[PDB]
């Protein structure tokens, strides 16, 4: 099969254009600029963010998990994308941490 | 718990700087430019790609799945990032499809 009914964890994708602050590749909190100019034309800084809808879609944790043997929950993974960030007075072009998916994490039961 | 042993699907993150062709936001195959200049300073176009290590990490499908009730496999999700492209003529700063995570998809058993 290819087309599934649902994933183990439910995702929520939102196009974000109102970004003001973000955590950089290292961990430093950087100021995000709303616009980016590509020599001749200007573009509004848009970011595709996908996060977890709920940490426990099922009482046991993730959907379709062997509950009697596994401790599970839904966590949000990250991606690193270049963004026009303002550092004090000068504009920089460096990677920033962004929510990109909702995955399930396992742990053995006692 | 927070820190898990392993996810339901195994991921593999690779920093890609050798991108020549990519699928755009609609589906059109576009030519990706190797460098991007900020009017004076130049930057090599780097993309953070995360894909599936294997579709079936476990014989049944994904790890820690209720095999007797669910049909499962690991699929690669996508993200959309702005990249300096060229549709044969000139510069185009438009969104492109990129591998970003490895998730598990479920299906009910007969």
């Amino acid at each position: 099969f290819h087309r599934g009914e649902f994933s183990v964890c439910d995702s929520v994708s939102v196009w974000v254009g109102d970004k003001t602050t973000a955590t950089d590749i290292k961990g430093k909190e950087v100021m995000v600029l709303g616009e980016v100019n590509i020599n001749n034309s200007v573009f509004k800084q848009y970011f595709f963010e996908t996060k977890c809808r709920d940490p426990n879609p099922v009482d046991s944790g993730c959907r379709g998990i062997d509950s009697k043997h596994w401790n599970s929950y839904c966590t949000t993974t990250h991606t690193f994308v270049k963004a026009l960030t303002m550092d004090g007075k000068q504009a920089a072009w460096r990677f920033i941490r962004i929510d990109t998916a909702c995955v399930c994490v396992l742990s053995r039961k006692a | 718990f927070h820190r898990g042993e392993f996810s339901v699907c195994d991921s593999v993150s690779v920093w890609v700087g050798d991108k020549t062709t990519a699928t755009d936001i609609k589906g059109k195959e576009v030519m990706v430019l190797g460098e991007v200049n900020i009017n004076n300073s130049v930057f090599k176009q780097y993309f953070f790609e995360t894909k599936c290590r294997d579709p079936n990490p476990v014989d049944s499908g994904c790890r820690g799945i209720d095999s007797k009730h669910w049909n499962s496999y690991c699929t690669t999700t996508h993200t959309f990032v702005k990249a300096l492209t060229m549709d044969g003529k000139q510069a185009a700063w438009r969104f492109i499809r990129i591998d970003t995570a490895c998730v598990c998809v479920l299906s009910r058993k007969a």
Partner: antibody
Amino acid sequence: QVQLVQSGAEVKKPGSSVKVSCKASGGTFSTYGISWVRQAPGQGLEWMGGIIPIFDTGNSAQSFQGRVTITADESTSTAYMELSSLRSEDTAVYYCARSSRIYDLNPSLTAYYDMDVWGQGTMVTVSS
Amino acid sequence: QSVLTQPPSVSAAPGQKVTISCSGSSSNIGNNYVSWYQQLPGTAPKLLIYDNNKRPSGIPDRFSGSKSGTSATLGITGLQTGDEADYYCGTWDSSLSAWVFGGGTKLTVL
């Protein structure tokens, strides 16, 4: 601020096809996932389908037997709903809605969205 | 006939807590998220609750939402004349691959 402006109310004959418009007044039309829900006078809500203009990926209800043809144009910022072969039972108030949240966006899953902001509505009457 | 089972009419006195029930199966509520809609006479529906409990901006703290298995409930505290409207159910059905709505509940205030 962002409001969904629909087409004017129409009265059509059985067997015809009505095309209802849904323009997003303001901006960021491609961001949302335009939905379509109909409501017969003094009856419940019936989901028809939807489309994401940025991906041009659509979804329709199986109950309609492929009569609904949901289309979208980013340039004009308008989403259209065409219901071919009109029946007396199709006499309803046709609403269009938007959602900034797109659930289950996966190549192996059918992507869906809620109905956050609703349109004013378009009354379609089928005279018999 | 509607997929989601809702009571036809509900009556309550002003300034009192009132509940509206919702019924379904594993195909919808059991493996998804419930959303509530407020439809005033001669007005378009309005999003009241989303993701079982969450409420959007503008909606007061007076409106509550809770989900338990294949059933969901809406809670309206501190009742008023303005609340007199038709309340609908809404969730995604994985098997039908369509958004399913409830019958509708007529809220009447003296």
